């Protein structure tokens, strides 16, 4: 019954199956035998729509008794900014449906091990964006944050990462970090945490995350979080990133395959895992002007659309090589 679900076998999903088969027809020769290759390399499946409580049954009915890794991305506010929406929840009310409605059927498969990573880029913009006028949705996410960890933190079949950015975003705010981390986890009943994502949807390296493992676990542990494990996604970090652009960077590459204890020298570790879907954009170039960034690629279609010239980018860009 070991605590650390990568160690069982990692669960394939239809999803990702048939966005790798679009560009699989658009390929010939040597670079559709590479697409034939990550077709069946294990993705998280995203919640990140009203409609993804819908969805959960269906990846574990496919998935048996292999590792499923979902990532919890509906909660109410993105951006503590003007004009932003259509992917969050209308409040807390709303949210507390959307993790009761999940962590149901989670219940009704006692069998099945499943990783739950709590949302992306929510501890992040806790830290470092600004406060004057955005108090109120602060607040509210960290209701949201513990409310999520309080359900899914006492399902058995379940594994709790909380997402904690990656270093160029927190590393030099390890201390503030562990301190917000810390006082959601105090508001989460009875319910406990696995570990800490990072790199979820960035370019780091492993070794520089590692570094931000090490710092940010330490803050942690002079808090009272103790035992805290990590997972870090290497799905586009094969290639060190040529600048802070996040949105769909050119250059990037796959990096290592999903493994887990991938490294002895990282007892902190528990596994790589590919949690951003390679070749799903970032955001479409028209969305944001980071997007129009030199070093974003161009033509993007709309956030979480298949963008086939990215993901042959990917392929080439690879390391590992193949
Ligand atoms: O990591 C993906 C995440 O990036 C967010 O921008 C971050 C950026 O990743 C980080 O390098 C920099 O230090 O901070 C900015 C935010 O100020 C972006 O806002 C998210 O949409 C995205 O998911």
């Known amino acids: 019954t070991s605590d650390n679900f990568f160690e069982n076998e990692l669960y394939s999903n239809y999803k990702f199956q048939g966005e790798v088969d679009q560009s699989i027809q658009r390929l010939s ?35 048996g008794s292999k590792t499923v890794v979902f990532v919890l ?98 590393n030099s705010s390890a201390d503030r970090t562990a301190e ?36 940010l676990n330490r803050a942690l542990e002079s808090r009272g979080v103790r035992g805290m494990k990590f997972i870090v996604d290497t799905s586009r970090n094969g290639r060190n990133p040529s600048s802070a652009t996040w949105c769909n960077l050119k250059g990037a590459g796959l990096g ?19 949690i951003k879907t390679p070749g799903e954009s970032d955001s479409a170039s028209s969305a944001d002007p980071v997007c129009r960034n030199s070093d974003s690629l161009q033509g993007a279609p709309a956030a979480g659309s298949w963008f086939h010239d990215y993901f042959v980018m990917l392929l080439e860009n690879a390391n590992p090589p193949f």
């Open 29 to 63: 020769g040597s670079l559709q035998e590479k697409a034939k290759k990550v077709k069946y390399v294990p993705t998280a499946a995203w919640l990140a729509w009203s409609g993804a409580t819908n969805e959960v049954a269906r990846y574990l009915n496919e998935a």
């Open 73 to 170: 991305y509906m909660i109410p506010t993105r951006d503590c900014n003007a004009g932003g929406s259509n992917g969050g929840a209308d409040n807390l009310s709303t949210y507390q449906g959307y993790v009761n409605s999940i962590y149901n059927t989670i219940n009704q498969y006692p069998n099945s091990r499943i990783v739950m990573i709590i949302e992306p880029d929510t501890i992040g913009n806790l830290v470092t964006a600004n406060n004057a006028n955005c108090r109120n949705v602060h607040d509210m996410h960290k209701q949201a944050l513990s409310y999520a960890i309080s359900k899914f933190g006492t399902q058995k079949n379940v594994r709790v990462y909380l997402d904690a950015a990656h270093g160029g975003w927190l």
């Open 180 to 215: 917000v981390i810390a006082e959601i986890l105090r508001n989460a009943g009875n319910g406990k945490i696995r570990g800490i994502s990072t790199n979820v949807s960035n370019y780091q390296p492993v070794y520089s995350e590692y570094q931000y493992h090490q710092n």
């Open 256 to 274: 290592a395959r999903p493994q887990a204890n991938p490294d002895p020298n990282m007892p902190l570790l528990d596994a790589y895992v590919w």
